[PDB]
Structures are given as structure tokens and as C-alpha cells.
Design a protein around this ligand. Structure first.
Ligand code: GTP
Ligand code: GTP
Ligand code: GDP
Ligand code: GDP
Ligand code: MG
Ligand code: MG
Lengths: 426, 428, 428, 426
């Protein structure tokens, strides 16, 4: 029944800053820590993410990890940085510098032991864990590097808990680190087989949505990470709150994974349009389904109609009829039958929660597992190869002891995921 | 003269919620149990509170908590409300084995406690769904034990029939195939309905294009009450549950009678229209009111039972039967003469305050065993096959200890079942 | 028709506090002794104050001081409140010998004074714990003298059974082994309960996850009152304490009947549920209400006594017995026919104001002698052995004059006791 | 029923300065000597540590001993130095200089006769002594040197009373006296067999706790000795006040000593965390047990999980359920079964008092006897040997007549304790 969340890397720490904000919004918990809500449900299932400390203080069940105090400090300095206890800030001193080898292989490795100890302390604080969630970037040093290391140890300690992670996937246009594909390649090599599932977030796609449908001209990462948190929070609240359908994360995982190795997801979100049009929108189930199916409302820079859909999850929040939902999902399946895989009859699955997100009447979360995902892997693998041949920045990595044959195997493994998507693309 | 209801899974429990609400409506039972006035289902306290003899099982706290926080939380005894912490995950492998098998002993002991409270246990019935983890997984686990302890008691099951078009459970074929294997052999009779078919009923007879499960289960509750409340109440032909089994199950396999219910009419549709017994029964043989999406005209009938509420005169019934026997296109299997069970209760049909169905003065429930059911199995056969050929999702069962051979076997058992339907279809 | 209660050690006294509180609750006795209204336990003064015929012994002032400063300080006669200055230190060697042996003469003379106040001493009972210094040390010392002076009077002991998992006394095995040696041979019957098992009762039947000793002793008090207050009060079958001994002790060894008590129900659990005599007795044969962590199904029964409070009709009891004799899995030793003592008091069960247990209209206490007790001894055997093999803590006894041979001997006496259980298990 | 306390050495005198302060806090006794409390219990068992002198004056039953008036004077100059009677200040003139030989063997020996006379006067003033307690440093001249001498004579006079002592054990990093291990070695040689039990306090560990969990950056010895007094006062109050369990010091001693020679203890304390986190802490029994088990909350620079646990005492103050305590202790035993010794079934014992320490809702004192203790002895013995061979400062000691063969035997005896811990480490 409970979940532990660990954030890492500057990305992960800033995403989590919005995530937790939202969760407390959902439950009426003040930036200082106490509960000042107003709904029974708000406290009722609070356990999944909060420990109530003496005084009616709620402690977010999460660990903030970094290798630079300053980022942690900036998190702590805002509202909701006060709700986190000092003991959840685990950090070192001297960066990682966006270096996998430092993060995973060497220096960051050193910190992980202290992180894990706190993890253990929290695992004991829970009655019964459902699972763990981690937030991070695929091409980052602590985000992926150190984060991955941690994941391998947590999974080891808890094989029976859900291990998932959401991660920022290097967008085709904006890479920061020259070896960002290298770090990503290494994380695939480690993560894929050490996780139950991973979500693919593309900032470029997010920037398109924010202007494309939301028509906004000023977003920052906090605004885009709001959208990220909308999908993350969407998933777990249902599990928390009363609904109609089947509201268990593990069951979601079961329904979305047809094969042990292909567990990559494309998140999307509805409704998600500018205020101008809000006066011209109608709120129906087909309306949400139109926004959910549309590739432009995906947060991943993929194109599901290019690939084939293996699995689709449609999560609904708010009062909807069962009939309408059933029929519209069927219609989707029918009309987009050319994209769905024939091996899975009725490949579109649903989940229904009766609690709407604060401020909306209804909402829906799109989760997909298509073959289209392989295109991201292909882009990375290719870029990787070029760098691999030149050893760009690999003296930094090999200087910290990372061996090229390990990287070679990592490359293969990327290619293996692509070939397996092809194996089920048919 | 007593019986036990068992509600497993959300579907089982939420349907049960409607069912017990209806029983309260039948007698004026207050949420706290106070009844001012049916002890076949209820157990009486010195306060005049009655306890519904039923067990609620959910391996996830939430649904039972929904009960625990609702009005009927005062009605139910805390021991009747049994909950685990974790789910089956849509998966027989955990529902029947890994997870549910841990709690079942408790569950059974509460059942046994109630069995000891019964003085004349007639039997029981289990509410669940063919696709879910606890809905079908745990359910069959229970049958495995109940059929030992209560071998001579009624073992009637009611389950939601997986909709051919919409299903939220990707491994539902696998779940249902495994249940076939284990339920066929243990249960006495399993009934089922299709929520998709029901939607069509709601939109055509009730004129509602927005059905939720809370509507859908009211309709189910109607059907159930006809066979549970009114069969214990007075009538001309008072039919028991054991009698139902003795009049509905023709073979030692299972059999699967399907529900049909007419009247299902909106208030406005009731106006300007006069139903007779015969007219209602005419509706009962129409595909249009068939609660499962399976064509009555496709198969042949083997069994049929008609149960009557309110203003029904046997005289009219007899005439109605004559016409359904001779007027209709109802083909039937040789084996059977048309001995259709007629239950005739004086007990009037009841309606849920704030519901969709019109107040009716008479009502007819129909159970039927048709050969068209094999097509339902055919649906499952291919769905299973597709998945199983690719071995999609197989690791979610294998990791819990399931065997691939077992799955093949279960399919084969289904195939055998289909073959027996084939057999029955061959007239002789 | 009189009796004496003896409270030795904290456990003995704090349990006693609950016991005498309950007796006050039984008759409306004021803290000052004023009773407006049971002289078998109490001695009357010209003011209408009654004095509980009991002796309180503690070698450490504190607990008795707790009595002396509480409300019941007015109830107890200052001479009944006996205290030393120093403790036994968890240690028989001081409790029975070095320290407690100094004060015991005083203690005995207060007992004798009360024995002279008795006109028809039926007997007495001693409350203590198997592991402590005074709890078991001093206790056996007392028995050594009481069995001489009061050789023909009831010598019933009640003791806390050392929890297998939690114990605060590292040399408890050693203490308990020494007591076996000396109590077996002197006492008539010793009863015991397991606080761990009780915790499980509190959390499952009372739904309390925070039991303290002040809760735990209320429950014990219930059991004790059933056999102490209500056996002196009116009933159908008025059973005496000597009768208890005469109906519970089958062999000249000891025997150790274990307590079981049903009803133990929270107020909310009492709602919506109707207990009968038979249903309560069904609960009495469930492991779940067993007050000692020892599995009733493991051993075989030798003795069993059922004592009834409140609304009990022998008619129902008879039926209940028939079913426990024939329905249950209760295996019993050949030697015994099922002559189970039935005590039937009209005296209703009582509840402590502000307590956890629900008001009940009838209640049943069960005493039972099962062969599974040898496993309890086995637990002690190894715990003792481990310590003794290493000779851990041995200097704390040796320095007081204990002999190593003696300790071996005491273990052997326990082994002999286990062997006699083995013997009884062999049916004949 | 009563206890006499004797403080010696600059350390012991300053520790006692805090100890007595706390005891008077516990009972509402004013720095000037009179009782101004407000609870029945506050006076009720006052006898164990105070004599009520005419006028409702309470005299702490303790002797302050030193060989330099100035330290004594500084003690006397503060609050609670006025509560001590002049007759409890026994001191000479001219130091010891941190010299065992002077303290024990020669000069300090001279003073001991006057100390003992006062001890006798107090033993008569008591109704019935439970025991004696002494506070001192193991590597100090009067602390250990003279103090030890006194102990051997008190034990002689009262074999039947509890003789325990708390002592500062030379920390690995901060030794003051070059021959501090020598003094310590000699004190083992004398003390171990002339005491019922001794507690091992490491200042280094204490300085880590004060910053590690308490997050403090200014402590002095008075702040660390506060922590020391918390453990000392924790033990005796229960004995004094009403509880649930078994509240007798001797019984504690009985339960904690499996073997005549191995009676060394590792004190620890809970709750013990900074105020920031106090808003994020929950107060439960498992919470206290988490702090109690954790080696970092030990006041001894040992590591109990390195060695094996022979005995554990868990003392609780405040209202707790019996169930919860029992269960959590069991859980500890279960989860840390790899550290406990198999010879002792259910090696974790408890004691429960219902009176909380002033200002807290609950608290717990950890007392352990592990084999890990031997590591301290090993460090000292080794250092000793080196010095022994060189006779560093032994001309001061041999100049005062201390013979090297006595020291040789002392060395053996240290090694004997280590071998016996090995004998029961298994
Ligand atoms: N008629 C009706 N069908 C329902 C209801 N709830 C769920 N169902 C159907 O039953 C199936 C859903 O089963 P789940 O809710 O996923 O699972 P479960 O059987 O409760 O057990 P778990 O998988 O372990 O959660 C689907 O086919 C639903 O369409 C309900 O209230 N009424
Ligand atoms: N049921 C119950 N058990 C108790 C109570 N007090 C103590 N015990 C149990 O009895 C044993 C404790 O004995 P102690 O309190 O240590 O000692 P004592 O027998 O009073 O005598 P001394 O050792 O000399 O103090 C443990 O096994 C406790 O769990 C109580 O009030 N109720
Ligand atoms: N959505 C999103 N992406 C971020 C944020 N911060 C850094 N990123 C992305 O993360 C990558 C850089 O990795 P970084 O987080 O600096 O690595 P690390 O800090 O060394 O672990 C780039 O692709 C960025 O676009 C953020 O707050 N939100
Ligand atoms: N905790 C603690 N240690 C002290 C104090 N004073 C001296 N010490 C320690 O005692 C040792 C020195 O011995 P000292 O007390 O000067 O000996 P003496 O005064 O000649 O008997 C060093 O290890 C110090 O850290 C104190 O007030 N508190
Ligand atoms: Mg469910
Ligand atoms: Mg005691």
C-alpha cells in the first residue's frame, strides 16, 4: 500500500519539487506541513505518500538526492521544501558533473550507501509497500548514473515491489552533455533489466504542447514539470482514491507489459488546451479521447501511429458513464485498428477513478506502449556509435575506470530492444 | 431454510451492495439493522437487528472500506467485512494461489461460523467476475474448499461474463480459461451476464445513454431478488434454491444458464402500455432483452425457467407457455421436453427508489441454457490462443508458479466443454 | 466457607488490585470498606466495613506503597500490607532463601491470624509469576509452610506463564525450573496464562493494539471472578473451590489446567451479534481464545471444566456439550471420560466500568488440562540448558548458596514431569 | 534503598555537577537547597539521593573529591554547589597531577582515609543502602588512581552493596596524558575485579552525537555531560519511581552480567535529535527503538554490530503499552539476530517506568554488553605495550614506587578480558 519516491539529479530534484507540491494540493496539505484540508478523502489515503509526524505534520515519503548542496538548498528554500525533513536530503559535495562514471561507477557510488540506509529506514516506516518511484534524467550523471546504481540495490532488496521510474529522455534537439547519449546508453544497459517500467519524457515535445495547444509563450521548466506531475499524480491517485475500475498500480503494470523486456511508456494528457478555447470546448468522454489519442498531446517525441500499439491505458478522473467510456474506447480501437497489434484482442484497457483533479471536471491520462519508442533508441544508438568510435569525453569516463567493452555491450542491448520491438512490430 | 451470500472482488461486492440494499428495501430494514418487521437471509439479534448472512471479501481495502464508510456499514458485522492488503493483479496466479490463498482460511472460518449459525443451511451463492484476479482467481479457490465442507449444499455461482468488446483486463482470457478448468468441476451452476448487453437494455428499454455500474448493478439486483427474496416469500408455487438447482442443471457439467429479464421499462415507457403475463414472457424470448450478447436464435434450448412476481395467474401463464412452445422459433434439444419451471410468487416486484425501472405489477425472470454458449467459449478460445501463441504476458503467471502445460490443459478442458455442447446440439 | 487470597510479587499484587477492585464492583463496596450490602471473602466490622481476607507481600516497598496511596488503601488493613526493603532480584536464591526467608515468618503469622479469623477455612489461592524472584522464589517458600499448617485446605496457585518470546528476566528458566521442583510437590494445582497470548486476544477480540498490564489484569480478573465470586454466589450448580480441586486434579502430580475465556468481546463486536451458550462454548474450544500460547490441537485433553455465568440454561448447555464431545476434533485421553464439570451460576457476568469488554448476559470460563503442556516444558528445558551449559549467570545463585547439582536435579524433575505427560498421552 | 555517589577527578567533579543538577530538577529542588516542587513523587522517594536536613533542606548524598581546592571551589561557586554541604568536599593540596602512583599508590592514598570516614558517616545516615556509584576518568590520577583505591575499600566494607562506576574511557583521538593508557591499564587491573559494573563513555562519540544528530556546533563538556547525566539519571529514577517493570538496580545488574568478569557497558540514549526534525518526528515505541539500536546513538565508541551482544537492557520512561514494547523488542531481537549470542534466549530485557523525563513525553536508555567492548581494551593494551617497553613517564611512576611487574600483570589482565570476550564471542 505505500510508495517511496526518490528524486535525483538537477532535473529530478526540480521535477519532484512540482510533484510533491501537487500531491499536497490534492490532499490540502500546507507548505509548512500541516493538514488543512477539507475532505475526508484527503486524509484517508494519505499514507501512501505521507507519514504523519507528531503534531499533524506530514512527511513526504521521498528522498532528495544530489551531489551539490546548492540545488538541494534551492529546493528547500521554497514552499514544500519545509515539509521535507532534513533527513531526506542526502547529498555530497562535489558534483558528478554529469558523469556516469562518477555517479555510478565511482564517486556517487560512495553516497549511495547513505541514501540506501535512509531508504531502509523508510521501508520500515511503511506498513506495506506497493512500490517505489524514481525521477530522473537519462543522460545525467546523478540522475541516471547514481540513480541507476540505487535502483539496482533497491530492486535487490525488494524484488517484490514495483520499480518504476520516469525519466527525461534526450530530446533530439537539446542535449546538454556531449555524451548525453552515452549516459543514456549506459542507463538502458542498466535500467531496462533492473526496472519494471520506465516512462519517456521529451522536453521538446513538451515545449511544443505548451505552445501548440496551451498557446503559452513563457514556460519554464516548472510549468513543463507541472505537466509531468499531472501524469504522475494522475496515476497514483486513483490508486489512492475510490473509483470504479481497477485501481492498482501493479495491475496497471501487468496490463501494460506483454513481454519482460519491453516496458517503455509514452505518457499523454487530457484535457489540455488554452483558456480561449475553453469557452468553446465541450466536456465529454469523446472529447477526452480525442485529446488522448492525438499524438500531439503526447509528452514523448514519438509517433504512435508510426509504430504499432502494443498496449493502451486510459485512466479517467471524475464522473463518467461506464457505457460512454466503453464505447469510446471501442471506437478508438475500431478506427485506429491499423495501429494496434493483432495479437492482443481489445488492446485498449481502462481504469476509472471518481475523483477529478482539482479545478477540473474531468481528466484523462494516456499511457502507451508502442513500437514507435524504438525510434528514440535508434537515434541514441546511432549517435552513440559515432561518439564511441571517437571516444569523445571517454577519457573522462575511462579515466574513472569505465571500460569500453561494457559500453559495447550497452550498445548491443540498445539494439536488442529495437530488434525486440521489431519482433513484435511484425 | 437458510443461505449464504458470498461477495468476492469488486464486482462481487458492489453487486452485493445493490443486493443487500434491495433486501433492505424489501423489508424496510434500517441501515443499522433495525428491522421492524426474512430470516432466511438474516440473523436476528435481541435488538431486533438483523444481520445479512453474507461474507465480503476483498484483498484490497478500498472497496470494503467503501462499505465500511457507507450507510450499510452499520448493517454489516465487522467480521463479515474481510480485507487483505494486496491484490491479485488481475491474476489467477495470485488470486487463487500466491496471495488469496493466505487469507482464505480466515474467510472460510467466517463462513463456517455462519454455517454454524445456520440451522438448516440450504446453500449458498457466490458473486464474482470471470475476469478478475479475485473475481475469478480467489473465487475458485473458495469453491475448492466449500465443495468439501458443504458438498451437499447449493453451490450457485454468479459471474460477470466478459464482454467481447470491452475488457480492461488483458489477460482476462487466461483468467477465465483457468477458471473454467477449476470451476466446472466444482461448482454446480454458474450464471452470467454481459455488461455490454446490459448497456443496450439500458439504452433501449430504459432509454439511458449514461449507465454506470451503479445502474447496471441495480438491474442485476432485480434479477437476483426475484430468485432470492421472492423465492423465500409466499406464492402459489414456492420454489426453493435447491429446487432451482434441481430444475436447472441437466448435466453434471456445467451448466451455464443465462439470464433474461423482462420487464425492464422506463417510467415513461410504462405509461400507455399494458403488460400481461403473456406479453412480458413474449419479451423474455426476444433477443433484445437477452442479458448476454449471444444470439438465442443461434442455439438450441436445453433448459428454461420462468419465475413470476406479483400479479400472475397460472391460468395466464399456462396460455403463455402454450404460445411460447408453439409460436416461437425456439428450437430445443431433443432431450428435453418442455418442462419449464414455473415459479409463481405472489410477492410483488420491487423497485429501487430513485432507480430507472418503472413500478411494475408483475414480473418475469428467465433462466436459459442454450447451445449458443459454445460461441462464447469460441471467443475465449481465440483470445487465449492469440496471447498464448505469442506468450504475451506469460511471465506474470509463470513467476507465480504457473505451468504452461496447465494453461494448455485448461484450454483443452474448454475445448472439451465446447465439444459437449456440440454433442448436445446433436439431436438425437 | 471462607478463603484467603495471597498476592506475592508485583504480578501477584497488581493482579490482586484488579481482583479486589472487581470484588468491590461485585457488591458495591466503597474504598473505605463500606459496603451497603459476600462474607466468604470478607470480614465484617461493626461499621459495616469489610475487609478482604487477603495478604499482600512485596519485598520492595514500592508496589505496596502504590496500594497504600490508591483508593483501596482504605479498604485494606495495614497489617495485610506487608513489605520488606529489598529484593530478590529475580532470583529464587534470594526470594526463597536469603531474603524472603527472613520476612516469611511475619507473613505466615498474618496468614495464621486470618486463618483464626476464618471459621470454616475452605482454602486459599496464591497469585504470582513463574519467573520472578518473589513471584516464584518466595511463593514456593510460602507453600512449604502453608502445606504443613493447612495441609487439608485448598492450595490453588495462579501464575503467570513465562512468555516464550518476551521475557525481561534472563534467568527466568532457572527460576521456573527451581519452582517446578518445589511447587509440584507441594501445591495442589497451578493455573497459568501467557501475556503474549493475551495480547493477541486483546488485539483480535477487543481490537486493542495498546494493552498494558492494567488491561491485561482486568481480563485475568474476569476469569478469576468467575471462579471466586460467582462460585460463592447462587446458582443451579453451586460449585465450591474444594469441588474445583476435586473435579480438576486427576493425578497427584501436578497438574496444570490452563485458562480459556470466551466471551472476550469489544463493545462494537457485541453489537450485531447474538451469543448463545453453545456459541460461547464453541469459542472456548478455539485456539484463538486460548490464554496460553500452546496449541490445543496438539495435545490431548485430560480435564475440562466449564463454568457458567448469567443467562445459562442447562438445557442449552447439555446440547452444547453434546456437540463439543462429538463435533470437535478434541482428542482426549482414554482415561477420561468426558465428565466435564459444569458450574452453573445464575450470578451474571460483570464488567469493569471503563473497561474494554462488552456487557454480556452470559459467560463461560474454561479450564483445561492438555498434554501440549509438555511442549511448554520443552521450551524451558532448552532455555535452561543453554544457560546452564554455559553456566551463564550462575554466580548470582551460587553466591547465595545454591548448588549446581540442585539445578540439574530440578531440570530432571521437569524431565520426569514431561515423561509423565508422555505417559498420559499414551493411551491405553 | 539508598545510594551514595562519589565523584573524583576534574572530570568526575564536573560530570557530577551536571548529574546532581538533573536530580534536583527531577525532584523540584532549588539550587539553594530547599524543595519547591510540585509533585508527590518528588518528595516521596527523595531518600535515595537526599538527606533532608532541618529546615527542609536536602543534602545530596555524595562526596566530592579532589586534590586541588580550585576545582572544588569552582563547583561550589555555581548553583547546586550550595546544596552540597562543606563536609562533602574532601580535598588535598597538591594535585596528583594525573599520576596514578600519586593518586593511588602514594599521596592520594593519604587523603582516602578522610574520604572514607565521611563515607562511613553517610553509610550510617542511610536506612538501607542499595549501593554506591562513582564518577570518574579511567586515565586520570584522581579520577582513576585515587578513586580506585577508594573503591577497593568501600567494597571491602560493603560486599553486599552495589558497586558501580561510570567512567570516561580514553578516546582514540584525544588523550591528554601521555600515559593515559597506562593509568587506564592499571585501573582495569584494579577496578574490574573490584566492581560490579562499569560504564564506558567516549567523549569522541559524544562529540559526534552532538553534531550528528543534535546538530550542535557549540558544546562544551557541560553539554556533553548533560547527556551523560541523562543516562545516569535514567537508571536511577526508575528505581525510584513507580513503573511497570522491574525496577531495581540490582536486578538490572543480575540481568546484565552473564559472567563474573565481563561487566562493561555501552550506554546509549533516545530520543536524541535536533529541534528542526522535531517537527518531523513521531513519538512511538519503534521510534525510540530505532534510536536505541542505532550504534550512532551510543555514547561509547564501539560498534555493537561488530561484536556480539551478550545482554541488552531497554529502559523506558513514560506511558507506553506493554504490548508495543514487547513486540518491538522482539522485532529487534529477530532482525538483529545475527548480532545476538545464541546462548541466551531472548537476550533483550526490558524495564519500564511510568515517569517521563522532564520536558519529554517518552525516553529510553540503552544499556548494552557486547563483545565489541574488547576493541577498546585492545587499543589500550597495544598502546600500553609500546609505552611499557620505553618506560615513558614511568620514572614518574616508578619514582613513586610503582613496580613494573605490577604493570606487567595489569597488561595480562587486560588481555584476559579480551580473551574472555573472545571465549564468549564464539
Ligand atoms: N456489472 C458489473 N461489472 C463490473 C463491476 N465492477 C467491475 N465489473 C467488471 O468486472 C471486471 C473487472 O474486474 P476488476 O475490478 O478488474 O477485478 P476484481 O475481479 O475486482 O479483482 P482484482 O483483479 O484482483 O482487482 C470487468 O470485466 C468489469 O467490466 C460492477 O460493479 N458491475
Ligand atoms: N499479567 C501480568 N503479568 C505481569 C505483571 N507484572 C509483571 N508481569 C510479568 O511477570 C514477570 C515479571 O516479574 P517481576 O516484576 O520482574 O518480578 P516479581 O515476580 O514481582 O519479583 P522480583 O523479581 O523480586 O521483583 C514478567 O514475566 C512479566 O511479564 C502484571 O501486572 N500482569
Ligand atoms: N523537464 C526537465 N528537464 C530537465 C530539468 N533539468 C535538466 N533537465 C534536462 O536534463 C538533462 C541534463 O541532465 P541534468 O539534469 O543536468 O544531470 P545531472 O544534474 O548531472 O544529474 C537535459 O536534457 C535537460 O533538458 C528540468 O527541471 N525539467
Ligand atoms: N566527558 C568529560 N571528560 C572529561 C572532563 N574533564 C576531563 N575529561 C576527560 O578526562 C581525561 C583527563 O583526566 P582528568 O579528568 O584531567 O584527570 P584528573 O583530574 O588528574 O583525575 C581526558 O580524557 C578528558 O577528555 C569532563 O568534564 N567531561
Ligand atoms: Mg479489485
Ligand atoms: Mg517486584
Amino acid at each position: 500500500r505505500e510508495i517511496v519516491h526518490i528524486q535525483a539529479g538537477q532535473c529530478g530534484n526540480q521535477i519532484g519539487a512540482k510533484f510533491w507540491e501537487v500531491i499536497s494540493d490534492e490532499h490540502g496539505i500546507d507548505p509548512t506541513g500541516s493538514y488543512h484540508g477539507d475532505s475526508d478523502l484527503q486524509l484517508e489515503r494519505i499514507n501512501v505518500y505521507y507519514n504523519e509526524a507528531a503534531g499533524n505534520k506530514y512527511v513526504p515519503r521521498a528522498i532528495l538526492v544530489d551531489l551539490e548542496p546548492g540545488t538541494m538548498d534551492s529546493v528547500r528554500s521554497g514552499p514544500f521544501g519545509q515539509i521535507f525533513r532534513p533527513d531526506n536530503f542526502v547529498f555530497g559535495q562535489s558534483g558528478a558533473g554529469n558523469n556516469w562514471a562518477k555517479g555510478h561507477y565511482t564517486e556517487g557510488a560512495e553516497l549511495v550507501d547513505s541514501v540506501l540506509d535512509v531508504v531502509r529506514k523508510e521501508s520500515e516506516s511503511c506498513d506495506c509497500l506497493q512500490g517505489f518511484q524514481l525521477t530522473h534524467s537519462l543522460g545525467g550523471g546523478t540522475g541516471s548514473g547514481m540513480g541507476t546504481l540505487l535502483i539496482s540495490k533497491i530492486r535487490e532488496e525488494y524484488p517484490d515491489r514495483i520499480m518504476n521510474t520516469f525519466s527525461v529522455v534526450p530530446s533530439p534537439k537539446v542535449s546538454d552533455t556531449v555524451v548525453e547519449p552515452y549516459n543514456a546508453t549506459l542507463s538502458v544497459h542498466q535500467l531496462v533489466e533492473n526496472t519494471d517500467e520506465t516512462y519517456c519524457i521529451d522536453n521538446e515535445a513538451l515545449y511544443d504542447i505548451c505552445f501548440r495547444t496551451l498557446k503559452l509563450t513563457t514556460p519554464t521548466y516548472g510549468d513543463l514539470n507541472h505537466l509531468v506531475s499531472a501524469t504522475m499524480s494522475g496515476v497514483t491517485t486513483c490508486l489512492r482514491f475510490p473509483g470504479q475500475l481497477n485501481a492498482d498500480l501493479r495491475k496497471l503494470a501487468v496490463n501494460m507489459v506483454p513481454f519482460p523486456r519491453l516496458h517503455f511508456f509514452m505518457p499523454g494528457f487530457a484535457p489540455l488546451t488554452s483558456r480561449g478555447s475553453q469557452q468553446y470546448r465541450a466536456l465529454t468522454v469523446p472529447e477526452l479521447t480525442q485529446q488522448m489519442f492525438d499524438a500531439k498531446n503526447m509528452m514523448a517525441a514519438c509517433d504512435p501511429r508510426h509504430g504499432r500499439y502494443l498496449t493502451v491505458a486510459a485512466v479517467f478522473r471524475g464522473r463518467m458513464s461506464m457505457k460512454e467510456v466503453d464505447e469510446q474506447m471501442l471506437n478508438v480501437q475500431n478506427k485506429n485498428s491499423s495501429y494496434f497489434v493483432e495479437w492482443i484482442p481489445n488492446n485498449v484497457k481502462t481504469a476509472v477513478c471518481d475523483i477529478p483533479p482539482r479545478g477540473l471536471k474531468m481528466s484523462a491520462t494516456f499511457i502507451g506502449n508502442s513500437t514507435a519508442i524504438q525510434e528514440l533508441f535508434k537515434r541514441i544508438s546511432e549517435q552513440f556509435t559515432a561518439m564511441f568510435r571517437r571516444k569523445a569525453f571517454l577519457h573522462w569516463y575511462t579515466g574513472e575506470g569505465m571500460d569500453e567493452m561494457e559500453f559495447t555491450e550497452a550498445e548491443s542491448n540498445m539494439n536488442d530492444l529495437v530488434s525486440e520491438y521489431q519482433q513484435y512490430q511484425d | 431454510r437458510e443461505c449464504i451470500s458470498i461477495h468476492v472482488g469488486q464486482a462481487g461486492v458492489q453487486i452485493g451492495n445493490a443486493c443487500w440494499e434491495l433486501y433492505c428495501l424489501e423489508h424496510g430494514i434500517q441501515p443499522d439493522g433495525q428491522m421492524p418487521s426474512f430470516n432466511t437471509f438474516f440473523s436476528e439479534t435481541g435488538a431486533g437487528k438483523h444481520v445479512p448472512r453474507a461474507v465480503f471479501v476483498d484483498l484490497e481495502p478500498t472497496v470494503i472500506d467503501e462499505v465500511r464508510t457507507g450507510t450499510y456499514r452499520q448493517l454489516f458485522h465487522p467480521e463479515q467485512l474481510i480485507t487483505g492488503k494486496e491484490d491479485a493483479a488481475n491474476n489467477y496466479a495470485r488470486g487463487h494461489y500466491t496471495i488469496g490463498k493466505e487469507i482464505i482460511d480466515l474467510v472460510l472460518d467466517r463462513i463456517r461460523k455462519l454455517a454454524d449459525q445456520c440451522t438448516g443451511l440450504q446453500g449458498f451463492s457466490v458473486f464474482h467476475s470471470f475476469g478478475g484476479g479475485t473475481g475469478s482467481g480467489f473465487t475458485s479457490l473458495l469453491m475448492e474448499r466449500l465443495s468439501v465442507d458443504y458438498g451437499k449444499k447449493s453451490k450457485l455461482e454468479f459471474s460477470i461474463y466478459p464482454a467481447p468488446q470491452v475488457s480492461t483486463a488483458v489477460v482476462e482470457p487466461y483468467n477465465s480459461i483457468l477458471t473454467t478448468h477449476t470451476t466446472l468441476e466444482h461448482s454446480d451452476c454458474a450464471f452470467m451476464v454481459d455488461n455490454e448487453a446490459i448497456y443496450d437494455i439500458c439504452r433501449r428499454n430504459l432509454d439511458i445513454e449514461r449507465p454506470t455500474y451503479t445502474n447496471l448493478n441495480r438491474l442485476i439486483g432485480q434479477i437476483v431478488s426475484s430468485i432470492t427474496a421472492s423465492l423465500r416469500f409466499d406464492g402459489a408455487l414456492n420454489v426453493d434454491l435447491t429446487e432451482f438447482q434441481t430444475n436447472l442443471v441437466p448435466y453434471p457439467r456445467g451448466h451455464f444458464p443465462l439470464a433474461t429479464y423482462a420487464p425492464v421499462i422506463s417510467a415513461e415507457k410504462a405509461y400507455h402500455e399494458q403488460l400481461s403475463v403473456a406479453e412480458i414472457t413474449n419479451a423474455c424470448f426476444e433477443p433484445a432483452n437477452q442479458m448476454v450478447k449471444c444470439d438465442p436464435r443461434h442455439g438450441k434450448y436445453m433448459a428454461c425457467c420462468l419465475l413470476y412476481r406479483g400479479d400472475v395467474v397460472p391460468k395466464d401463464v399456462n396460455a403463455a407457455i402454450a404460445t411460447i412452445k408453439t409460436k416461437r422459433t425456439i428450437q430445443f434439444v431433443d432431450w428435453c421436453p418442455t418442462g419449464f419451471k414455473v415459479g409463481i410468487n405472489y410477492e410483488p416486484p420491487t423497485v429501487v427508489p430513485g432507480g430507472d425501472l418503472a413500478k411494475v405489477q408483475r414480473a418475469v425472470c428467465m433462466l436459459s441454457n442454450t447451445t449458443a454458449i459454445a460461441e462464447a467459449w469460441a471467443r475465449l478460445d481465440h483470445k487465449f490462443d492469440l496471447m498464448y501463441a505469442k506468450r504475451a504476458f506469460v511471465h506474470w503467471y509463470v513467476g507465480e508458479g504457473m505451468e504452461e502445460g496447465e494453461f494448455s490443459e485448461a484450454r483443452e478442458d474448454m475445448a472439451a466443454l465446447e465439444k459437449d455442447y456440440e454433442e448436445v446440439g446433436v439431436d438425437s
